[PDB]
């Protein structure tokens, strides 16, 4: 049913039934975004690591992610519970004299 | 090396080949190429030829061949006498049908001497009738030659069979006067040598007629020529050429003139005795 | 002294199939693989032959005119003087008398007394609808055969006819053509 | 993922600190329950007289 | 299956089955990037060395690397566990007077 879990054509090895698409709407795949949500930061080490788990698998009906800067629809994997596109931003200044 | 060691090694290789051809047998007793997904009659008849060749030397189970032939007779035999395969220019369809029919006739005739059956004889009669009826027009040299060989494996003195043989001899290509080389070309006014198959089939047909004078030029042709070679499938033509050379050597051995003639009277003594030799 | 293709690889071992490959490396435009055929089907080795450009189909006692049913064995173009060739009867017939043709010194033949008497009649090739009873290869004189058009509509005319060695004469174009 | 599943399947059960220390450096000490994509910048300078 | 391990055509010597591609998406090979991740630095010597091991081999389904400056997809070999594209940057200044 167009659900890539194991490999490119591993799960799609043999299909006797028709290739029924899971979703008809055009939803662009998550390109370079938080799709790689796994991070293995070392408290004694340095910056976070890569993903220790698979983050491409999805379970059932597509969950729409109708948000972002431009007009485009991304996918949210079944492993990622939530993702927001809030463009928060802050900065501080300070100075003193002795 | 000693001939006995080579013969034992060849027997071991023949046993390995028998195990291999047994591995290609499906549960439905048919013969397939790739894992048994689809059934093919061409490879089935090829394996039947191989098993008929094996029959003469060591052993082959008859029950596994009788039902294998009955499967083809029941399924792949058309009521008209034609034969087809399941695994996959209007006259090209009829040409391919006659090709498959001749191939199946060759296979069933090779496998018939070990499993004589009335139903197999009926199938052979129907297929021979089909080939004799539908080979009237000149369609292709290769198809004509394979049909002539499939009919020569059976009855060799049929009127339509002799007409087909005469047509094939008229369609033959020669070089020199007297002809030193004799061969057959499929394409008219034409890995590139495709006529070797029809030349080998016509050689086998002529060897079935026991004509040394007509076979000698084809032997000269297949000995050395522009093949280089130069054949298909392989070994659809390689084994045919090997069998042709084998039949040529066998027929040469047949003409030894070692006959010992002793003519005598029925109720009285012998009159004379002839000792015939080559000299 | 002032990308480019690299050197080709060695020819791989000839596989069980024709497919033999050779690969070039761009280390550019061209091909990276070349797949050719190999079987070594030519086992015999006699010598390098010389070939012509193109040929044609067709350029002592000559080939005689055989009697009825023909069937001359060991057919050749020219027979030597004094050589005798035996003639046989075509199926279904049988050789009666003296069946031999000896080459005379001149171009004529002896033409000995010989004839062909029918011993068995053959199965008719009229149409594929039969399935003729009885269904055999040959039938001896005195046996009757019956043909029908299965399974419904049938053809009128002689249904049962036997072969007495009298040169069966059934129609060949409109033999039965059983209509509804 | 298949690699992490294979690593957990081919894993001892008698407190092998040696292999566990390697696995720890290989796949981190603890993963992220929630992250924050983006980027930060900062500049500091100090003066003393 | 398009998995180069031994040589250019060494592993691809003979292919009886169809050349099934391992991945359908267009993923550009790692050009001049951390692909050469092996380094043999000498603590008593000088700057790191080249790679002491093969870094082109890959095991199974392609692992996407949808990140970077531009919109391009790189490959991560099965030998490299993780690779990040963080463009960190820092600098310091100091001065004093006696």
From Swiss-Prot, chain B:
Glycans are attached at residue 80. Transmembrane segments: none annotated. It comes from the Eukaryota. It is found in: Secreted; Target cell membrane. Membrane attack complex (MAC) assembly is inhibited by CD59, thereby protecting self-cells from damage during complement activation. MAC assembly is also inhibited by clusterin (CLU) chaperones that inhibit polymerization of C9. Disulfide bonds join 66-115. Complement C5b is composed of complement C5b and complement C5 beta chains that are associated via disulfide bonds. Component of the membrane attack complex (MAC), composed of complement C5b, C6, C7, C8A, C8B, C8G and multiple copies of the pore-forming subunit C9. Interacts with the tick complement inhibitors OmCI, RaCI1 and CirpT1. Interacts with cobra venom factor (CVF). Component of the membrane attack complex (MAC), a multiprotein complex activated by the complement cascade, which inserts into a target cell membrane and forms a pore, leading to target cell membrane rupture and cell lysis. Complement C5b is generated following cleavage by C5 convertase and initiates formation of the MAC complex: C5b binds sequentially C6, C7, C8 and multiple copies of the pore-forming subunit C9. This is Complement C5b.
From Swiss-Prot, chain C:
It comes from the Eukaryota. All cysteine residues are assumed to be cross-linked to one another. Individual modules containing an even number of conserved cysteine residues are supposed to have disulfide linkages only within the same module. Glycans are attached at residues 5, 8, 11. Residues 3-39 form the TSP type-1 domain. Residues 60-118, 119-180 form the Sushi domain. Residues 38-105 are annotated as: CCP 1. It is linked to Complement component 6 deficiency: A rare defect of the complement classical pathway associated with susceptibility to severe recurrent infections, predominantly by Neisseria gonorrhoeae or Neisseria meningitidis. Component of the membrane attack complex (MAC), composed of complement C5b, C6, C7, C8A, C8B, C8G and multiple copies of the pore-forming subunit C9. Belongs to the complement C6/C7/C8/C9 family. Component of the membrane attack complex (MAC), a multiprotein complex activated by the complement cascade, which inserts into a target cell membrane and forms a pore, leading to target cell membrane rupture and cell lysis. The MAC is initiated by proteolytic cleavage of C5 into complement C5b in response to the classical, alternative, lectin and GZMK complement pathways. The complement pathways consist in a cascade of proteins that leads to phagocytosis and breakdown of pathogens and signaling that strengthens the adaptive immune system. This is Complement component C6. It comes from Homo sapiens. The gene is C6. The chain holds residues 551 to 763 of 934 of the full protein.
From Swiss-Prot, chain D:
This is Complement component C9b. It comes from Homo sapiens. It comes from the Eukaryota.
């Amino acid at each position: 049913n167009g659900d890539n879990d194991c490999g490119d054509f591993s799960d799609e090895d043999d299909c006797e039934s028709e290739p029924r698409p899971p979703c008809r709407d055009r939803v662009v795949e998550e390109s370079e975004l938080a799709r790689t949500a796994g991070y293995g930061i070392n408290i004694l080490g340095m910056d976070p690591l890569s993903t220790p788990f698979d983050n491409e698998f999805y379970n059932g009906l597509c969950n729409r992610d109708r948000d972002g800067n431009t007009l485009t629809y991304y996918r949210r994997p079944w492993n990622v519970a939530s993702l927001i596109y809030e463009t928060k931003g802050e900065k501080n200044f300070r100075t003193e004299h002795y | 090396s000693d001939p006995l060691i080579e013969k034992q090694k060849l027997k071991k290789k023949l046993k390995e080949g028998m195990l291999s051809i047994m591995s290609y047998r499906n549960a439905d007793y048919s013969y397939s190429v790739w894992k048994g997904g689809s059934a093919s009659t061409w490879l089935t008849a090829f394996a039947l030829r191989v098993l008929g060749q094996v029959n003469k030397y060591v052993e082959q189970n008859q029950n596994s061949i009788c039902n294998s032939l009955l499967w083809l007779v029941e399924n792949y035999q058309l009521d008209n006498g034609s034969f087809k395969e399941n695994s996959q220019l209007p006259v090209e369809a009829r040409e391919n049908s006659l090709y498959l029919t001749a191939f199946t006739v060759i296979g069933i005739r090779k496998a018939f001497d070990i499993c004589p059956l009335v139903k197999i004889d009926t199938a052979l009669i129907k297929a021979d009738n089909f080939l004799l009826e539908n080979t009237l027009p000149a369609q292709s040299t290769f198809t004509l030659a394979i049909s002539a060989y499939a009919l020569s494996l059976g009855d060799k003195t049929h009127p339509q069979f002799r007409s087909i043989v005469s047509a094939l001899k008229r369609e033959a290509l020669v070089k020199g006067n007297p002809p030193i080389y004799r061969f057959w070309k499929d394409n008219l006014q034409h890995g590139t040598a495709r006529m070797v198959e029809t030349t080998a089939y016509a050689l086998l047909t002529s060897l079935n007629l026991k004509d040394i004078n007509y076979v000698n030029p084809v032997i000269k042709w297949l000995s050395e020529e522009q093949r280089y070679g130069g054949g298909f499938y392989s070994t659809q033509d390689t084994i045919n050429a090997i069998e042709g050379l084998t039949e040529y050597s066998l027929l040469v051995k047949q003409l030894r003139l070692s006959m010992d003639i002793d003519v005598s009277y029925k109720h009285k003594g012998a009159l004379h005795n002839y000792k015939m030799t080559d000299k | 002294n002032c990308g480019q293709w690299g050197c080709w690889s060695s020819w791989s071992t000839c596989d069980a199939t024709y497919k033999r490959s050779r690969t070039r490396e761009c280390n550019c435009e061209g091909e990276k693989r070349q797949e050719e055929d190999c079987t070594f089907s030519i086992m015999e080795n006699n010598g390098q032959p010389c070939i012509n450009d193109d040929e044609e189909m067709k350029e002592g006692c000559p080939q005689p005119v055989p009697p009825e049913n023909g069937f001359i064995r060991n057919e050749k173009q020219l027979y030597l003087v004094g050589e005798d060739v035996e003639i046989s009867c075509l199926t279904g017939f049988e050789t009666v008398g003296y069946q031999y043709f000896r080459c005379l010194p001149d171009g004529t033949w002896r033409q000995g007394d010989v004839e062909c008497q029918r011993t068995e009649c053959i199965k008719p090739v009229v149409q594929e609808v039969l399935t003729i009873t009885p269904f055999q290869r040959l039938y001896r004189i005195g046996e009757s055969i019956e043909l029908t058009c299965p399974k419904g509509f049938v053809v009128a005319g002689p249904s049962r006819y036997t072969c007495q060695g009298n040169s069966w004469t059934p129609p060949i174009s409109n033999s039965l053509t059983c209509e509804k | 993922t298949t690699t992490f599943v294979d690593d957990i399947k081919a894993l001892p059960t008698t407190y092998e600190k040696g292999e566990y220390f390697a696995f720890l450096e290989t796949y981190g000490t603890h993963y992220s329950s929630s992250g924050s994509l983006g980027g930060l910048y900062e500049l500091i300078y100090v003066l003393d007289k």
